[PDB]
Amino acid sequence: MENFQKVEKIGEGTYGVVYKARNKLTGEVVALKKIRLPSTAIREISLLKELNHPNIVKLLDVIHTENKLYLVFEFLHQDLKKFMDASALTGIPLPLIKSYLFQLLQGLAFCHSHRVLHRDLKPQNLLINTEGAIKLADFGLARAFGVPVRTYTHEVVTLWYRAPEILLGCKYYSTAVDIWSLGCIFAEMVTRRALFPGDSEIDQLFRIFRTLGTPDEVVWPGVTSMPDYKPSFPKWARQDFSKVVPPLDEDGRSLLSQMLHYDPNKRISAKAALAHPFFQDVTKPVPHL
Numbered sequence: 441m442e443n444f445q446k447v448e449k450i451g452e453g454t455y456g457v458v459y460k461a462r463n464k465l466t467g468e469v470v471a472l473k474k475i476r477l478p479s480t481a482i483r484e485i486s487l488l489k490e491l492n493h494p495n496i497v498k499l500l501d502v503i504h505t506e507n508k509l510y511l512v513f514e515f516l517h518q519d520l521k522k523f524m525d526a527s528a529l530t531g532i533p534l535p536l537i538k539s540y541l542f543q544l545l546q547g548l549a550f551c552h553s554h555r556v557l558h559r560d561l562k563p564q565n566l567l568i569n570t571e572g573a574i575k576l577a578d579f580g581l582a583r584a585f586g587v588p589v590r591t592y593t594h595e596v597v598t599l600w601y602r603a604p605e606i607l608l609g610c611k612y613y614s615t616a617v618d619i620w621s622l623g624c625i626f627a628e629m630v631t632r633r634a635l636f637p638g639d640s641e642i643d644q645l646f647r648i649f650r651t652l653g654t655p656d657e658v659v660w661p662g663v664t665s666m667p668d669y670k671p672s673f674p675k676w677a678r679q680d681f682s683k684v685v686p687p688l689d690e691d692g693r694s695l696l697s698q699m700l701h702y703d704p705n706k707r708i709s710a711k712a713a714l715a716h717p718f719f720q721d722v723t724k725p726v727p728h729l
């Protein structure tokens with residue numbers, strides 16, 4: 441009642457509960473996020489008030505009061521997950537898929553240029569508006585809170601978009617982790633079905649392996665010395681993307697292939713992806729929702 445009016449509960453997010461609230465001074469509606477519990481996190485998150493871009497959900501405030509931590513974000517009404525589910529009989533139209541991917545790559549390119557990663561992109565944290573924009577939510581929170589090593593949520597943590605280096609225990613998180621996640625989301629928009637819906641770390645890893653082939657030192661130098669690599673992993677051959685994401689055209693399949701290279705160093709960058717021929721005919725359509 442001093443600062444905010446509660447409007448309604450939005451749900452249980454990756455970091456805790458999320459409410460729709462109304463700022464009493466400005467009259468604006470916001471997403472107010474209570475972090476389910478350091479000083480270090482508050483400094484890191486507070487710097488994210490500078491990481492502003494049209495395709496990043498805007499961080500409005502960081503509140504530390506009564507030994508509790510709250511983040512205030514711009515409000516958007518729908519996530520990509522809900523929109524895909526609502527679109528499932530028809531699919532999202534291709535021009536809108538392309539628009540959504542282009543915009544997300546612009547947001548990634550900006551953050552990556554500042555050496556900030558997301559680490560946990562998923563359809564539930566890609567928010568859309570009624571004119572055709574899409575925005576990345578919760579960008580830069582995972583490094584501040586130690587995600588994905590640390591877990592805050594009450595829900596099962598969704599492994600479906602995790603890059604293979606994370607699943608194999610790598611120490612070092614590069615920009616490539618976000619390109620992988622986005623590639624998985626691209627495939628999901630096209631096919632209307634998650635690409636790698638693993639229900640455990642090994643099921644996640646084996647779903648990747650069955651589609652892309654079991655990784656080896658030929659495609660990914662050093663993979664066999666990763667902390668969680670097992671020489672006893674089954675050896676699957678790679679499938680062609682033409683079987684994986686029909687009816688995507690060869691430009692799209694080439695782009696997707698590059699987003700899903702095993703070796704993070706070989707993964708296409710967001711800036712290079714924006715120049716791909718898949719985007720020659722990109723436009724900004726209006727969504728049907």
Ligand SMILES: COc1cc(Br)ccc1CC(=O)O
Binds near residue numbers: 441505508
């Ligand atoms: C972040 O906001 C709160 C935190 C606590 Br504890 C109690 C009440 C509020 C709402 C307000 O201050 O209006």
Ligand SMILES: COc1cc(Br)ccc1CC(=O)O
Binds near residue numbers: 444445446459461472
């Ligand atoms: C004083 O508590 C809140 C304030 C605001 Br704004 C949002 C949500 C709550 C939790 C609750 O109402 O249980």
Ligand SMILES: COc1cc(Br)ccc1CC(=O)O
Binds near residue numbers: 451455564
């Ligand atoms: C209730 O969950 C959300 C709420 C908002 Br607003 C943005 C993102 C999420 C998903 C998550 O944090 O996983």
Ligand SMILES: COc1cc(Br)ccc1CC(=O)O
Binds near residue numbers: 459472474508510
């Ligand atoms: C679940 O409680 C809240 C959630 C949000 Br968002 C804002 C404020 C509160 C009150 C509290 O932290 O007691």
Ligand SMILES: COc1cc(Br)ccc1CC(=O)O
Binds near residue numbers: 630686
């Ligand atoms: C050419 O049709 C598609 C191709 C791809 Br890939 C995805 C979605 C559609 C539906 C449409 O855009 O109407």
Ligand SMILES: COc1cc(Br)ccc1CC(=O)O
Binds near residue numbers: 452594595
């Ligand atoms: C989804 O519900 C939960 C899961 C776990 Br683990 C702990 C507590 C809850 C309830 C809550 O405090 O909202």
